[PDB]
Amino acid sequence: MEVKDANSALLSNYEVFQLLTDLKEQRKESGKNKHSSGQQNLNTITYETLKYISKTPCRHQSPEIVREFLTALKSHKLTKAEKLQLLNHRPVTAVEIQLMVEESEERLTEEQIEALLHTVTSIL
Amino acid sequence: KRITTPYMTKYERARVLGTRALQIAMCAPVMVELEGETDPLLIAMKELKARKIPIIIRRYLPDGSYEDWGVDELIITD
Amino acid sequence: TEGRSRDGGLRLGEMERDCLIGYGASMLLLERLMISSDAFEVDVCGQCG
Amino acid sequence: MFVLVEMVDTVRIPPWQFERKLNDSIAEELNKKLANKVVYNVGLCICLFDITKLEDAYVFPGDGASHTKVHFRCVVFHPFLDEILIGKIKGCSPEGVHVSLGFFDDILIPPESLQQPAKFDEAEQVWVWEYETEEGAHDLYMDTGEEIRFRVVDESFVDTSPTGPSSKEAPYTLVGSISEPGLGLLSWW
Amino acid sequence: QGRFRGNLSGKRVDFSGRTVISPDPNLRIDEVAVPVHVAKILTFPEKVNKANINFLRKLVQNGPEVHPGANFIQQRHTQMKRFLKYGNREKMAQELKYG
Amino acid sequence: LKPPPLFPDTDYKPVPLKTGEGEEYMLALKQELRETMKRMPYFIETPEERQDIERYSKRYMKVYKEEWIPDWRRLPREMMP
Amino acid sequence: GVSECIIMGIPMNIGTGLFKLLHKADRDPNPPKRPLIFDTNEFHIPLVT
Amino acid sequence: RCPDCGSTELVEDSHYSQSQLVCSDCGCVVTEGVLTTTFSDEGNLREVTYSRSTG
Amino acid sequence: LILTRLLVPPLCIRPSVVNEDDLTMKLTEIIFLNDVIKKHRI
Amino acid sequence: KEQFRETDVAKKISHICFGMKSPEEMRQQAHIQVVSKNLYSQDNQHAPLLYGVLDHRMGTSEKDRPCETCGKNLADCLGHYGYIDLELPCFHVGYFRA
Ligand SMILES: [Zn+2]
Ligand SMILES: [Zn+2]
Ligand SMILES: [Zn+2]
């Protein structure tokens, strides 16, 4: 076992949820063999992660809406990391955006923050 | 293209038979219908006769290159 | 062990080794000389060798 | 928080698995091998993302199984520093508050991260809260609680490799922060 | 008698026997006649599978004294052996599993 | 029956020191050397590497320094920086 | 050499030990890659000018 | 005690040439194989009085 | 390339009764001579 | 939840490098320092001396006494090394020509 890259790419919680949903689709389709503890390892981790994400706002998202959202967000000149937390959390009041963006007051003025708030509350 | 001889040398025959017999000894599907034999080596011999053994030979040349031959396209002779 | 007073075990001499080399059978003399004589398992450190 | 990593390995396929297509059995085997474990450097692994490329399936002498080398990508849990997460409380301790993330449990909120006026309770382990005008030193955080908001500020790996000839703490640790307004119980905001 | 000549290059092995030889012109040129006494001592480990479940069951039932029978059994998972002289029951043969 | 302790006792002990104001002055000088030889390009440290994410602070705290070059007429022509 | 292979318990390189065998399993190298939605290249541009 | 059935009826017994310790009630083998010096070293035996070996 | 220490071989390559193997006799006589020379020089 | 590790670590010999051992390195190899001439203890229990030769922290050769360095009996002990310090340096036979 050897790792070639440790940070190749980031991911959105929607994609992880889609993969786990697919895993659920080929889960319980046949009688469990109970061959070894790896069954319970895999089942527990997948079920727990699914249940956790089942209490997140990113649910009911779809690929097209997220691509359009990030296309619109392209022009606002934020870092990719910022964009991912905005997509993952869906902020609803100003203060959490004040905290999220580094140098929020200096880089963005009030009207721009209001624009971000409206965009996130409307698109998602 | 391929340059090595098309005949299956006796060493290839020996090792293919042995490896397939070991595979059959462990629980592995048998390609050809078996009459009731119980010795894995005889079953491997029948699989070779019917040309159904699922093994691929890789003839390594001393310079480093190699050629892949399927068991069913060598000339198995006496 | 060696004798018949003690339970024995026959010897694969230095000439049978050359006969088996001559036949070209590579797994059979491995089975004769390691698997069924003194197959032992050790552990080696690759850092110091 | 999830991250994608690239991986290489070799997988053994016992002969009785020869009937099934290789791409499925190999994935099942290595996902069996890797699921619900934490690597020393990249963090906690969830499951295989996808397989990218396969080498030839050699059969080694003295064996019946076929060994194949695998190139594949795996999804792993590894939030980065200053990231904000929401998670349920697990319990209270004198050194802080432990937060459970559903599947991950080693998250701690030290009292330094907690808001200053509250620093100890009335000999009851349930951590209490204080505030200037309202909340007259009567609010307290439940050991289960809701999904409080917090930001990670520290993280560390610890080795569990055996020491000395042969014959319990989690190897992955996280620390969070709650001081900033809007962090913690959503009922506060 | 040193290591290289005596031990490494050629060494003693087990599962082998020695005896006098005699003629028998009623055999083919690729057969050898083995005494029943030596047949009962040398043993070959057969792996159990779908092809020969019943043959090995009969051999186990015969026991270690009547010639077409077996001496030892190894469980599929636990490495411990089982010596058929003190078996007390035929149900070993029923208990045989693949492996 | 028992091997001796890893430290046997020695009767001749370290002869006392020899101190002086000039010796303290030298002590200073050496501490100063130790301090200053870290503050020029000749102290070639390992190049900055292993960036983590696109954090914003790199607009400011990135260290800036000129590409040091000696007189190249006195050195062969195979090591252009 | 033959002698070293014999006195170290590994198969020799002449006779039945000169070639390698593969398994003719039903397999598909470089399969269709799982596609990714969010992290597509064209939607990332460095923020530094 | 036999690890498989717990009975205490262990009997030391040897097959044709193999020494072993067998549970006489379930056939399990708990310990097999011995390591014994042979004639080749039997010819070299010396003697040291223990009093000498003890100083 | 000039020696000042020796590794004493493990027990397993020198059985209990050769009573004991001759390598043990050689080792004991060496250490005896070492103690002799040490105490006598002192 | 437990740290990942490799279950199988099988490997193969590829090269053998001959060499020598420095005195400090062969000290590092050893487990104990043999110091005494005698072999056994005064009493009739006949247990071998502690820091003398025959100490079982260097293995074992009896079917009933386990090695103390590793809790394994004769059939399973790989063996261990001790070292003897030499009080005057001496030459080596095989290396004299060198
Ligand atoms: Zn080492
Ligand atoms: Zn029993
Ligand atoms: Zn030991």
UniProtKB/Swiss-Prot annotation, chain A:
Function: DNA-dependent RNA polymerase catalyzes the transcription of DNA into RNA using the four ribonucleoside triphosphates as substrates. Specific peripheric component of RNA polymerase III (Pol III) which synthesizes small non-coding RNAs including 5S rRNA, snRNAs, tRNAs and miRNAs from at least 500 distinct genomic loci. With POLR3H/RPC8 forms a mobile stalk that protrudes from Pol III core and functions primarily in transcription initiation. Pol III plays a key role in sensing and limiting infection by intracellular bacteria and DNA viruses.
Keyword list, A-Z: Antiviral defense, Cell membrane, DNA-directed RNA polymerase, Immunity, Innate immunity, Membrane, Nucleus, Transcription
Protein name: DNA-directed RNA polymerase III subunit RPC9
MF terms in GO: calcitonin gene-related peptide receptor activity; DNA-directed RNA polymerase activity; nucleotide binding
Gene Ontology terms describing biological process: defense response to virus; innate immune response; neuropeptide signaling pathway; transcription by RNA polymerase III; transcription initiation at RNA polymerase III promoter
Highest taxon, organism lineage: Eukaryota
Gene behind the chain: CRCP
A GO term from the CC aspect: plasma membrane
Organism: Homo sapiens
Family membership: Belongs to the eukaryotic RPC9 RNA polymerase subunit family.
Tissue: Ubiquitous. Most prevalent in testis.
Membrane topology: Peripheral membrane protein
Subcellular location: Nucleus; Cell membrane
From Swiss-Prot, chain F:
Tissue expression summary: Barely detectable in differentiated tissues. Expressed in embryonic stem cells and in other dividing cells, such as some tumor cell lines.
Protein localization: Nucleus; Cytoplasm
Induction section of the entry: Induced by NANOG and POU5F1/OCT4. Negatively regulated by the interaction of microRNA MIR1305 with 3 miRNA responsive elements (miREs) in its 3'-UTR. Transcriptionally regulated by MYC. down-regulated upon cell differentiation.
Known partners and oligomeric status: Component of the RNA polymerase III complex consisting of 17 subunits: a ten-subunit horseshoe-shaped catalytic core composed of POLR3A/RPC1, POLR3B/RPC2, POLR1C/RPAC1, POLR1D/RPAC2, POLR3K/RPC10, POLR2E/RPABC1, POLR2F/RPABC2, POLR2H/RPABC3, POLR2K/RPABC4 and POLR2L/RPABC5; a mobile stalk composed of two subunits POLR3H/RPC8 and CRCP/RPC9, protruding from the core and functioning primarily in transcription initiation; and additional subunits homologous to general transcription factors of the RNA polymerase II machinery, POLR3C/RPC3-POLR3F/RPC6-POLR3G/RPC7 heterotrimer required for transcription initiation and POLR3D/RPC4-POLR3E/RPC5 heterodimer involved in both transcription initiation and termination.
UniProt record similarity statement: Belongs to the eukaryotic RPC7 RNA polymerase subunit family.
Protein name (database record): DNA-directed RNA polymerase III subunit RPC7
Source organism: Homo sapiens (Human)
Gene name of the encoded protein: POLR3G
Shown stretch of the complete protein: 32 to 112 of 223
Curated annotation (Swiss-Prot), chain G:
Coiled coil: none
Tissue specificity of this protein: Expressed in the brain, in the cortex and the white matter (at protein level).
Locations listed in the record: Nucleus; Cytoplasm, Cytosol
Disease: Leukodystrophy, hypomyelinating, 7, with or without oligodontia and/or hypogonadotropic hypogonadism: An autosomal recessive neurodegenerative disorder characterized by childhood onset of progressive motor decline manifest as spasticity, ataxia, tremor, and cerebellar signs, as well as mild cognitive regression. Other features may include hypodontia or oligodontia and hypogonadotropic hypogonadism. There is considerable inter- and intrafamilial variability. Wiedemann-Rautenstrauch syndrome: An autosomal recessive, neonatal progeroid disorder characterized by intrauterine growth retardation, failure to thrive, short stature, hypotonia, variable mental impairment, and a progeroid appearance. Clinical features include apparent macrocephaly, sparse hair, prominent scalp veins, entropion, greatly widened anterior fontanelles, malar hypoplasia, and generalized lipoatrophy. Death usually occurs in early childhood but survival to third decade has been reported.
Family that this chain belongs to: Belongs to the RNA polymerase beta' chain family.
Protein name: DNA-directed RNA polymerase III subunit RPC1
Gene: POLR3A
Full-protein interval shown: 1342 to 1390 of 1390
Swiss-Prot record, chain H:
Residues in TFIIB-type zinc fingers: 1-31
The organism's place on the tree of life at top rank: Eukaryota
Coiled-coil annotated spans: none
Expression induction or repression: Down-regulated by epigallocatechin gallate (EGCG) treatment.
Binding site for Zn(2+): 2, 5, 23, 26
Subcellular location as annotated: Nucleus
Protein's job: General activator of RNA polymerase III transcription. Factor exclusively required for RNA polymerase III transcription of genes with promoter elements upstream of the initiation sites. Contributes to the regulation of gene expression; functions as activator in the absence of oxidative stress. Down-regulates expression of target genes in response to oxidative stress. Overexpression protects cells against apoptosis in response to oxidative stress.
Protein family according to the UniProt entry: Belongs to the TFIIB family.
Subunit structure, as described in the record: Component of TFIIIB complexes. The TFIIIB complex has two activities, alpha and beta. The TFIIIB-alpha activity complex is composed of TBP, BDP1, and a complex containing both BRF2 and at least four stably associated proteins; this complex inhibits the transcription by pol III via its phosphorylation by CK2; YY1 facilitates the TFIIIB-alpha complex formation. Interacts with TBP; this interaction promotes recruitment of BRF2 to TATA box-containing promoters.
Protein name (database record): Transcription factor IIIB 50 kDa subunit
Organism: Homo sapiens (Human)
Residues of the full protein shown: 6 to 60 of 419
